[PDB]
Design a protein around this ligand. Structure first.
Ligand code: ATP
Ligand code: ATP
Ligand code: ATP
Ligand code: ADP
Ligand code: ADP
Ligand code: MG
Ligand code: MG
Ligand code: MG
Lengths: 292, 209, 202, 298, 347, 356
């Protein structure tokens, strides 16, 4: 399976230098991003420390483990409410600690023809094995995460084998300790009883909802790059922000700056955020003439 | 130069080469079905004046079916041990190929090998892969399997009417196939292999021990 | 030695004289090249426990025909074919085959049972036939197939032709295991996770 | 000259000689060259369908002035269908026997050769040979394989036998209305194939083949029992009367099982009881004779 | 003398080439019959005026240089489909469909013959006219009825003389047809059965569907290039509409969707008269009983009766056709589709 | 007859003397092929014919290894297989037709009712090109790139036209189906060429229309053999960033399906502001009725509020279709003006047929 350089007449292997793969796998090699600090995520610092206690020390200090005799795991899951800390945390981990990032989407494994995802996943890991400092990041894994049970047409072939080829690549017959696996879902209930536990994953890192001080902590960081007046109460912001994630709290922070840009004001007030919050859900009906 | 004919297409199966090692009486329990296949395959090759005197014209082929574990291949190998005519082994999924057109051509390729050779015997194991009944073949792959059924259907009872050749089939479940295969004239022996009852277990217990 | 030129062998012709220089055994179709060259775990039945009633019983059916055929000639029995591993996920099922492929590894193949079909409709059964011929030629081999459930299934009615290929794939696997060709010195360790929806003919 | 071949030099590419014997590769399936295979009387029963075929083939050719005097054309498309096939092959050979005419047999899978264009090329090279010999009848076989339905492009369709099928509609109609050439189409189950050529602009004759009647079962039974040995005191009519709507193909199957039961006694004599066990063996239908499925519904 | 030197300057076994593109610098790119493309030079006596992308030239074996341009009967595929002679009866052939005649007259004859209603107000004429409905509901007969009463040329496209396998012949004949529509009178583009080419807008990866989607897109491009069309009328007709291209049903391209509903026993009596007109109708036959009994039959069925009535007269060696022949043709031919009706339940 | 380019002898008589002979032996025959990849500091070009084979060859000593990139036609020697002259894939008849710089005949009053979206388009386009100081004086980045999305026929083009006639400088409309080409790697060179030639002049506005074709639709899920939608999309998101700060050329997109939405495009730097288009409540519809009826001869004693009441859910394309239909009813009879009942039957013809 090598693309050697052969003479046209004498048929002699002259040079080899192949380094060739599928176009879709080479499209997935995503590296060299701008950096991001761990202090950008507020309120989820325990899960950040549980990541620093999971991945970098198998990479940095292998001799920290080999004297104790233990073996580092290689599967970490992000799950919880969507839009909080799943993709953005590993984006910053690949930003500072450069370890040859390799994303993997969910529906891109699902192709039209039969027998494509088992080609695509296995070619994605042959590339991951040859690049020794590389890592693997898998996102929206619930999109191919069924329960293997309901033999209902026609997802018994396009999702199942793409799952079960992937499941055979985690432990398999032959070990694979060179590369690390990071998965990111939103639904734990839909996942295969083989797509869970140790060997594969076991590191259920739950993400709670960001609280009032956490939402006050997220909004301060996104507002730091802009001009903000120092007379901003974070108690009022923590109170009025209800059931928001950091994505929505970022979207409030953008809208509060743009309203100040319309009137030309070089500062922000709490009313600028109270306008920015109500702009998000597109404030609507007063009554329904059923309720007196 | 002009070559001798059939310098050509694929395998001459064994005819003496690696032939299966089983005796005829190695079968335990089968008595009617053991005799019925012999009476329409082997006995036509040996005793020929008995048929032409009465006007029997022994059948072109035989369909075998039933649940797994009754003896299909082992009974066929006892025929393949004790025949003197040409045997032909054919895997039923041998013609499934990607190259369009060669599927129906290989069925044409095997039967010309049978016509040049001895009063041969053709065995194809799985028929349920190729013989299922038809509908609007709305895919490409459904049209692939469908036309090879008909080339098989044409070169079994056409205008030439290939003489002295026998087509032995041994399916698993013979209802999910085409009804124009089950018509008499190609498959005149609808032999079932049921599970062995009492008075036969003691025959099978004897032959093992 | 023209007697070695069987009608169906492979040779190497001259470029200009075109006559036969050297004959070759058989192609080994590099899709299954990677299905042999791998190390199990360098284990020695010491990474396993609480299964010794089932370990020894599996070592009984496999290790005897590939070492000790005199115990099977003294008793009027045919040496057996392969076994099956079924149960809930987590208790062996891969390390157990990893154990037996470390002890007396003459030849070994590990089939994933999900890299065996593709877009092409006649490729699947062609890959299985050329697999076992590699296994048949290198006589004292052991065959492991994970996840038979992937190509299992009960053979049912009208089934939207993408599943008809899997049935025709399975019918090829039936006749190659127990069919016309006498499978000798070749044993097959099958392994599944749900032993409910498989073929009763299998 | 139309469809003329030449001898061409290979280095200078110059003409060498006009070749004779106009283009017709693979004529082994065609030009059957042997008339005696079956006589005329061995069919029986279905005598109406014979007169329909004799007067759609021999009548336009031998007496064309009957049809060229009215003001209408001659029919050239003949469809034949019978779902168990109650005489399709035997009826065509007796026509091919008793015609004194050149005959062309075309199997319905031999146009998909390996790759593109080649099976589409031999179509035009085929019918010019049938036009080269004006007394000729082309016979198709199982056109279910060649042409079912015009699907989409290369996604979920073949789109290659569409290229060959489109020629066959165009080769007989669209350029020149041919003459003295009659095609015969024999396949059953008319829903799979296309209905575009099934319009009366192309096919004028659609002859069905019903299951045989009691006298029709009796006459086929007398043909197969003619070459056999019979004992006196036997009724062939009751054998046809014990066949509730038979197929005619199983009249052979009774005559095989009856002679085979006489074989295992080493006896050249046969009774009516041997036929009664032969019919009852072949009558294996999934009819569920519990007297409760056909009996809750009187 | 000079003509013989240049006719002998090139090689004698001239190979039939194929142009692909033209660069104006004494060379071009061509294509062989095997698809191998050769970056060759072009001569100067090659008469560089007829050189079009898609034509054929003459090439060498040594350097494969462009020897000379090759004719190809100049276009065998736009002159066959052009109607030269007269179609069927003008307006008296059809019957009962006079609701739709004012549609097609005012959309075609009125932009051409009297283009002043559009100038008193400023309302542009329509371009696309769609004819759909039941299969064989009289769309062929109606298109020939309108095309008879005309003062301009008419074009008749089958629909299967558009798709080839030469990778460029698809979008080529679009410009070949519309040039004939431009050079001649502002003709009526009638491309029948456009449903085989235009449906659901799918893209695959093989080389089988790519000759369809581009030609579909190029026709939609060449219809609405919006540079100069000269009032080209386009009539498009299929049977079905629900598995067709939705972006041609949207406005901006076609704003006429003419449907042909099912007729009654009123329209039949002319069709019985027209089909029983060019025959030896004997004066002892009755047709009015055949109209009254059967309640579902089309123009194809009556023509199938008239041929069967013609065949039964020739069997017993006669010239005229008797009444029992029409009765036996009514009871033999029309027994093929009578299945399914709710009788005795409705009032 | 065998014409073979007769060319009556006045234009080639001097050309047929020896200029043909200098085109035979010095001028060799080359072949055009495809480049797969390249290597650094040593060329080592891997090139296929796709009919013969794949070849690992080198450029000859006549050109420079500067223009030779992946996916480019070259002049291959017939024997030594060397690249002699690189061929461009037929550049560039798709730029002069785009940047027409032509005055459009669209009144600014032709977009009425949806005034909230005009000012949002006014701040993004007009203000950082003519008053960029307010973005400097505060500390927010100048916005570049705004995706447009909503129902079709809403007036996506007219809002994209209302900024076109405002400044009258370098208006470029990109058709989304135009970049769908046959050749592999054909449109990705053009997006390089369209970007580099728009930066030679200042105050240029490029609009992307029907980005359901190439603007990140299904990124690569249906094309398993072609791979051109992906190669153009990966090239345009690469060339969009990496440079151009502070605003020189504004880029706008518009889609119909609100599904083809990349989160990587929603990284700040590519697409920042969300501007969508919605349906008129009452008066934006009646704004369409008054414009689409002055062009034709109508009655001066009719109203257009009654027609918008009969259109609960409708676009201006549908309203235009009524005005064309109601015009034809006056053309059925001999009416030279448009009365009210022609409109009333047209509304019952359009809406009460298939819509509701
Ligand atoms: N009546 C019998 N006498 C002796 N051996 C038998 C008998 N029935 C079954 N066997 C044994 O059982 C095994 C299975 O039989 P066989 O291989 O013929 O299966 P089959 O009938 O071909 O079809 P399937 O494989 O679906 O069961 C054989 O190897 C044979 O040794
Ligand atoms: N019975 C056992 N004895 C010792 N170790 C075990 C046992 N079962 C599992 N292990 C441990 O589990 C790991 C191997 O996993 P194992 O092969 O059991 O997964 P599996 O059962 O094959 O999963 P699946 O059934 O989903 O394929 C090894 O690291 C081993 O230490
Ligand atoms: N009327 C008949 N006269 C003589 N033989 C008949 C008649 N009907 C049926 N047969 C017998 O039936 C068998 C099938 O006949 P034939 O070959 O014409 O049909 P077929 O087209 O092969 O059937 P199918 O359409 O199912 O393929 C033949 O062996 C023939 O002897
Ligand atoms: N605690 C936080 N600190 C900073 N940014 C946050 C925080 N929570 C959410 N965000 C913002 O929300 C966006 C969505 O997070 P993401 O990783 O995409 O979650 P998911 O992958 O589940 O959608 C991120 O781009 C990030 O900018
Ligand atoms: N304010 C308005 N005044 C007049 N006509 C309008 C107005 N808004 C929309 N339209 C109509 O809507 C149509 C929009 O057409 P188009 O540009 O195809 O929309 P899209 O780009 O959304 O598909 C225009 O033809 C125009 O006649
Ligand atoms: Mg068996
Ligand atoms: Mg396992
Ligand atoms: Mg037949």
């Amino acid at each position: 399976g090598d693309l050697v350089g052969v003479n046209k007449d004498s048929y002699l292997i002259l040079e080899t230098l192949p380094t060739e793969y599928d176009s879709r796998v080479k499209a997935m090699e995503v590296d060299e991003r701008p950096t991001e600090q761990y202090s950008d995520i507020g309120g989820l610092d325990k899960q950040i420390q549980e990541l620093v206690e999971a991945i970098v020390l198998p990479m940095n200090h292998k001799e920290k483990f080999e004297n104790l005799g233990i073996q580092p795991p290689k599967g970490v899951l992000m799950y919880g409410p969507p839009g909080t800390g799943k993709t953005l945390l590993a984006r910053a981990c690949a930003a500072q600690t450069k370890a040859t990032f390799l994303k993997l989407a969910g529906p891109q494994l699902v192709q039209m023809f039969i027998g494509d995802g088992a080609k695509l996943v296995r070619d994605a890991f042959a590339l991951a094995k040859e690049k020794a400092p590389s890592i693997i990041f898998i996102d929206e894994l619930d999109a191919i995460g069924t329960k293997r049970f309901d033999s209902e047409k026609a997802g018994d072939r396009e999702v199942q084998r793409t799952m079960l080829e992937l499941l055979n690549q985690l432990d398999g017959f032959q070990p694979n300790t060179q590369v690390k696996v990071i998965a990111a879902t939103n639904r734990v209930d839909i996942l295969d009883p083989a797509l869970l536990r140790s060997g594969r994953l076991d590191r259920k890192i739950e993400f709670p909802m960001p609280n009032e001080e956490a939402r006050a902590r997220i909004m301060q960081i996104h507002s730091r790059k802009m001009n903000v007046s120092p007379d901003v109460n974070y108690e009022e912001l923590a109170r009025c922000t209800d059931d928001f994630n950091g994505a929505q709290c970022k979207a409030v922070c953008v809208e509060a700056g743009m309203i100040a840009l319309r009137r030309g004001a070089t500062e922000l007030t709490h009313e600028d955020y109270m306008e920015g919050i109500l702009e998000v859900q597109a404030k609507k009906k007063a009554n329904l003439q059923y309720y007196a | 130069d002009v070559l001798p004919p059939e310098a050509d297409s694929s395998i001459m199966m064994l005819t003496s080469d690696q032939k299966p090692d089983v005796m005829y009486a190695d079968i335990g329990g089968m008595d009617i079905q053991k005799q019925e296949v012999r009476e329409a395959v082997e006995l036509p090759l040996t005793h020929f004046e008995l048929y032409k005197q009465i006007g029997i014209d022994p059948p072109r082929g035989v369909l075998m079916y039933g649940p797994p574990g009754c003896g299909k291949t082992m009974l066929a190998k006892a025929v393949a041990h004790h025949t003197t005519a040409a045997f032909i082994r054919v895997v039923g999924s041998e013609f499934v190929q990607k190259y369009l057109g060669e599927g129906p051509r290989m069925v044409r390729d095997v039967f010309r090998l049978a016509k040049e050779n001895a009063p041969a015997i053709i065995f194809i194991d799985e028929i349920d892969a190729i013989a299922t009944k038809r509908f609007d073949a709305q895919t490409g792959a459904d049209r692939e399997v469908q036309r090879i059924l008909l080339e098989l259907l044409n070169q079994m009872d056409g205008f030439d009417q290939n003489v002295n050749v026998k087509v032995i089939m041994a399916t698993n479940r013979a209802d999910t196939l085409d009804p124009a295969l089950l018509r008499p004239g190609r498959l005149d022996r609808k032999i079932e292999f049921p599970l062995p009852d009492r008075r036969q277990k003691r025959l099978i217990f004897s032959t093992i021990t | 030695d023209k007697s070695k030129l069987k009608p169906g062998t492979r040779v190497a012709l001259d470029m200009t004289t075109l006559t036969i220089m050297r004959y070759l055994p058989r192609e080994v179709d590099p899709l299954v090249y990677n299905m042999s060259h791998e190390d199990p775990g360098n284990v020695s039945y010491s990474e396993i426990g609480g299964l010794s009633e089932q370990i020894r019983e599996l070592r009984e059916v496999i290790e005897l025909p590939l070492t000790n055929p005199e115990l099977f000639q003294r008793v009027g029995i045919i040496p057996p074919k392969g076994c099956l591993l079924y149960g809930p996920p987590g208790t062996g099922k891969t390390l157990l085959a990893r154990a037996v492929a470390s002890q007396l590894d003459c030849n070994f193949l590990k089939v994933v049972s999900s890299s065996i079909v593709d877009k092409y409709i006649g490729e699947s059964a062609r890959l299985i036939r050329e697999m076992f011929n590699y296994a048949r030629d290198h006589q004292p081999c052991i065959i492991f197939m994970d996840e038979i459930d992937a190509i299992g299934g009960r053979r049912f009615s009208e089934g939207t032709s993408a599943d008809r290929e899997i049935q025709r794939t399975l019918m090829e696997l039936l006749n190659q295991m127990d069919g016309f060709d006498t499978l000798h010195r070749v044993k097959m360790i099958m392994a599944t996770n749900r032993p409910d929806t498989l073929d009763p003919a299998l | 000259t139309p469809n003329c071949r030449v001898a061409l030099r290979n280095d200078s590419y110059t003409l060498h000689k006009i070749l004779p014997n106009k283009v017709d590769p693979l004529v082994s399936l065609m030009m059957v060259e042997k008339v005696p295979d079956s006589t005329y009387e061995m069919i029986g029963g279905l005598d109406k369908q014979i007169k329909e075929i004799k007067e759609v083939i021999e009548l336009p050719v031998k007496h064309p002035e009957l049809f060229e005097a009215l003001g209408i054309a001659q029919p050239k498309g003949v469809l034949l269908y019978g779902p168990p096939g109650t005489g399709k092959t035997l009826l065509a050979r007796a026509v091919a026997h008793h015609t004194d005419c050149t005959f062309i047999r075309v199997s319905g899978s031999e146009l998909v050769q390996k790759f593109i264009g080649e099976g589409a090329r031999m179509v035009r090279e085929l019918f010019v040979m049938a036009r080269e010999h004006a007394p000729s009848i082309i016979f198709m076989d199982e056109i279910d394989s060649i042409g079912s339905s015009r699907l989409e492009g290369g996604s979920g369709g073949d789109s290659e036998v569409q290229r060959t099928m489109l020629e066959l509609l165009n080769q007989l109609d669209g350029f020149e209305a041919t003459k003295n050439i009659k095609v015969i189409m024999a396949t059953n189950r008319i829903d799979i194939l296309d209905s575009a050529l099934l319009r009366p602009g192309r096919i004028d004759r659609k002859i069905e083949f019903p299951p045989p009647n009691e006298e029709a079962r009796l006459d086929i039974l007398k043909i197969h029992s003619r070459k056999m040995n019979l004992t006196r005191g036997i009724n062939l009519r009751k054998i046809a009367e014990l066949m509730p709507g038979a197929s005619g193909a199983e009249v052979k199957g009774v005559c095989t099982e009856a002679g085979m039961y006489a074989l295992r006694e080493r006896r050249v004599h046969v009774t009516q009881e041997d036929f009664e066990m032969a019919v009852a063996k072949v009558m294996q239908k999934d009819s569920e004779k519990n007297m409760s499925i056909k009996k809750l519904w009187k | 003398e000079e003509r013989s030197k240049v006719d002998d300057l090139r090689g004698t076994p001239m190979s039939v080439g194929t142009l692909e593109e033209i660069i104006d610098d004494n060379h071009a790119i061509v294509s062989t019959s095997v698809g191998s493309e050769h970056y060759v030079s072009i001569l100067s006596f090659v008469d560089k005026d007829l050189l079009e992308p898609g034509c054929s030239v003459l090439l060498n074996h040594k350097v494969h240089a462009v020897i000379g341009v090759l004719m190809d009967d100049t276009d065998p595929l736009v002159t066959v489909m052009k109607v030269e002679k007269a179609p069927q009866e003008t307006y008296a052939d059809i019957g009962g469909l006079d609701n739709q005649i004012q549609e097609i007259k005012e959309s075609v004859e009125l932009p051409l013959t009297h283009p002043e209603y559009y100038e008193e107000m400023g309302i542009k004429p329509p371009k696309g006219v769609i004819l759909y409905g039941p299969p064989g509901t009289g769309k062929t007969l109606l298109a020939k009825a309108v095309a008879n009463q005309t003062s301009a040329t008419f074009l008749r496209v089958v629909g299967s003389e558009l798709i080839q396998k030469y990778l460029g012949d698809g979008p080529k004949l679009v410009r070949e047809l519309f040039r004939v529509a431009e050079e001649h009178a502002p003709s009526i583009v009638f491309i029948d059965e456009i449903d085989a080419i235009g449906t659901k807008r799918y893209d695959s990866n093989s080389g089988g569907e790519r000759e369809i989607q581009r030609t579909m897109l190029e026709l939609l491009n060449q219809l609405d290039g919006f540079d100069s069309r000269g009032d080209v009328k386009v009539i498009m007709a299929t049977n079905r509409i629900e598995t067709l291209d939705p972006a041609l049903i949207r406005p901006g391209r076609i704003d006429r969707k003419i449907e042909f509903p099912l007729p009654d026993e009123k329209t039949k009596k002319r069709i019985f008269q027209i089909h029983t007109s060019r025959m030896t109708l004997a004066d002892d036959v009755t047709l009015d009983d055949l109209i009254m009994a059967k309640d579902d039959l089309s123009g194809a069925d009556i023509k199938a009766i008239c041929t069967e009535a013609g065949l039964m007269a020739l069997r017993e060696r006669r010239m005229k056709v008797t009444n029992e022949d029409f009765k036996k043709s009514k009871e033999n031919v029309l027994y093929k589709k009578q299945e399914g009706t709710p009788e005795g339940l409705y009032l | 007859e065998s014409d073979t380019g007769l060319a009556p002898p006045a234009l080639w008589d001097l050309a047929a003397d020896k200029q043909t002979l200098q085109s035979e032996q010095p001028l060799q025959v080359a072949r055009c092929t495809k480049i797969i990849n390249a290597d650094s500091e040593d060329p080592k070009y891997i090139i296929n014919v796709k009919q013969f084979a794949k070849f690992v060859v080198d450029l000859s000593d006549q050109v420079a290894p500067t223009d030779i990139e992946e996916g480019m036609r070259v002049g291959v020697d017939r024997n030594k297989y060397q690249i002699h002259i690189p061929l461009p894939p037929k550049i560039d008849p798709t730029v002069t037709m785009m940047q027409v710089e032509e005055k459009p005949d669209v009144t600014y009053s032709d977009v009425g009712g949806c005034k909230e979206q005009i000012e949002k388009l006014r701040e993004v386009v007009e203000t950082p090109l003519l008053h960029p100081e307010r973005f400097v004086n505060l500390g927010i980045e100048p916005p570049k790139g705004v995706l447009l999305f909503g129902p079709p026929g809403t007036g996506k083009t007219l809002c994209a036209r209302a900024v076109a006639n405002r400044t009258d400088a370098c208006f470029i409309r990109v058709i989304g189906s135009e970049l769908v080409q046959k050749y592999v790697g054909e449109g990705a060179r053009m997006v390089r060429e369209l970007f580099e030639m728009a930066r030679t002049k200042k105050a240029c506005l490029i609009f992307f229309d029907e980005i359901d074709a190439i603007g990140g639709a299904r990124f690569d899920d249906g094309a398993g053999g072609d791979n051109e939608v992906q190669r153009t999309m990966l090239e345009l998101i690469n060339q969009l960033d990496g440079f151009d700060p502070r605003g020189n050329i504004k880029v706008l997109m518009a889609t119909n399906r609100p599904d083809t939405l990349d989160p990587a495009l929603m990284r700040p730097g590519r697409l920042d502001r969300k501007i969508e288009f919605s349906l008129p409540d009452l008066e934006g519809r009646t704004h369409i009725f008054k414009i689409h009826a002055r062009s034709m001869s109508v009655e001066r004693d009719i109203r257009f509020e009654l027609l918008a009441r009969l259109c609960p859910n409708s676009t201006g394309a549908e309203i235009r279709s009524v005005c064309t239909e109601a015009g034809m009813f006056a053309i059925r009879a001999r009416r030279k003006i448009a009365t009210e009942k022609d409109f009333l039957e047209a509304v019952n013809k359009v809406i009460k047929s298939y819509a509701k």
